Design a protein around this nucleic acid. Structure first.
Ligand SMILES: [Mg+2]
Ligand SMILES: [Mg+2]
Ligand SMILES: [Mg+2]
Ligand SMILES: [Mg+2]
Ligand SMILES: [Mg+2]
Ligand SMILES: [Mg+2]
Length: 306
RNA sequence: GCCCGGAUAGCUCAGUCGGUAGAGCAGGGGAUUGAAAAUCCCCGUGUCCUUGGUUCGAUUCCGAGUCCGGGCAC
């Protein structure tokens, strides 16, 4: 029953600023919960905290992967669980910060044990999709596992491939393995969510930030990655907002003005989904990004002195 | 100045053999178990620029005006 804090929130919601200000009055250690901040070399498009901020408040799980190696909600959970153990072992409190809700969830509720990704069976699935379409595969999942086929839409290639993969590797069906649940988070958690008061102030912040990034050398950063020659668009790192568009721009597929437009829209569509996650998230305390930055007080009380 | 194209959804455009119109993008909502900043589901009424003419009926055809792209000319 150790204590832990979750500081969730969409992009451009001032999450980071709040976490370090909290580090000031609470014995907390920061753990980054972000599928893109894990990459080395991806610093400005990911809104990664700068060296000075990191100097003040060290973050765990930052720069732990090369953009060529994918991460997962499961690896995060493992690494997070371990990091939390270390932190609480030192008499302090884990403060998990980020906007990757699926990770927060996997950590909180756990994940039913399933086989990890197998490049080989996925290549075979991709090949059969190019030949017969994702339809033949959905019709095949329908035979072996129809609970899943009713949930997964025939147009969702990621989930479809995933449900077949699990079966082709284990022989056991996806709905069957998921009957066994994962280990819940053995902590007492205080969950907070912070966002600007209006959807449109969020949009303004997203737009002005994108421009600050371009002004800070974002293009140069993405080019260094483009020049490596070993990265591609089926990699999570290259599909990150901003990066995917800039990649299209470097490839000569779109113009500069067009890249800026799509990056901003992509960032807004991302924010919109993060809010969809937070809506209905159980036990969440809402805070406000706009000036109520002095929201550390609501935190202060919900968590009470520690 | 003259000629030729455009002008229809917040943007880029289709379309209507004349019976008041629909895609994509933007935007909104919702899913979400090892790629998740991903992947996917659902939501389309707008003076069809204006004005005359023909017509039961015009955004649609024809004239004219206005604005926007080009071209010709100075
Ligand atoms: Mg047209
Ligand atoms: Mg007709
Ligand atoms: Mg309509
Ligand atoms: Mg949309
Ligand atoms: Mg008329
Ligand atoms: Mg007319």
């Amino acid at each position: 029953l150790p204590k832990a804090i979750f500081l969730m929130g969409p992009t451009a919601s001032g999450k980071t600023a709040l976490a370090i200000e909290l580090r000031k009055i609470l014995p907390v250690e920061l753990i980054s919960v972000d599928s893109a901040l894990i990459y080395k070399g991806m610093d400005i498009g990911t809104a990664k905290p700068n060296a000075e901020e990191l100097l003040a408040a060290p973050h765990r799980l930052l720069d732990i992967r090369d953009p060529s190696q994918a991460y997962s909600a499961a690896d995060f959970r493992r690494d997070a669980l371990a990091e939390m153990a270390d932190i609480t072992a030192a008499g302090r409190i884990p403060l998990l910060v980020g906007g990757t809700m699926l990770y927060f969830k996997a950590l909180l509720e756990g994940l039913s044990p399933l086989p990890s990704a197998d490049p080989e069976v996925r290549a075979r699935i991709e090949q059969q999709a190019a030949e017969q379409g994702w339809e033949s595969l959905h019709r095949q999942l329908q035979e072996v596992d129809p609970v899943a086929a009713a949930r997964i839409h025939p147009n969702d290639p990621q989930r479809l491939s995933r449900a077949l993969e699990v079966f082709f590797i284990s022989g056991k069906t996806l709905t069957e393995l998921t009957q066994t649940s994962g280990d819940a988070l053995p902590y007492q958690v205080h969950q907070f969510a912070i966002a600007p008061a209006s959807r449109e102030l969020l949009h303004q912040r997203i737009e002005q930030r994108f421009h600050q990034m371009l002004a800070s050398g974002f293009e140069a950063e993405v080019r260094a990655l483009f020049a490596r020659g070993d990265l591609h668009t089926d990699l999570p790192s290259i599909r990150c907002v901003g990066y995917r568009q800039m990649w299209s721009y470097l490839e000569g597929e779109i113009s500069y003005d067009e890249m800026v437009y799509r990056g901003v829209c992509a960032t807004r569509q991302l924010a919109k989904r993060q809010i969809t996650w937070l809506r209905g998230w159980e036990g969440v305390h809402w805070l406000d990004s706009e000036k109520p930055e002095q929201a550390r007080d609501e935190v202060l009380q919900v968590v009470g002195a520690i």
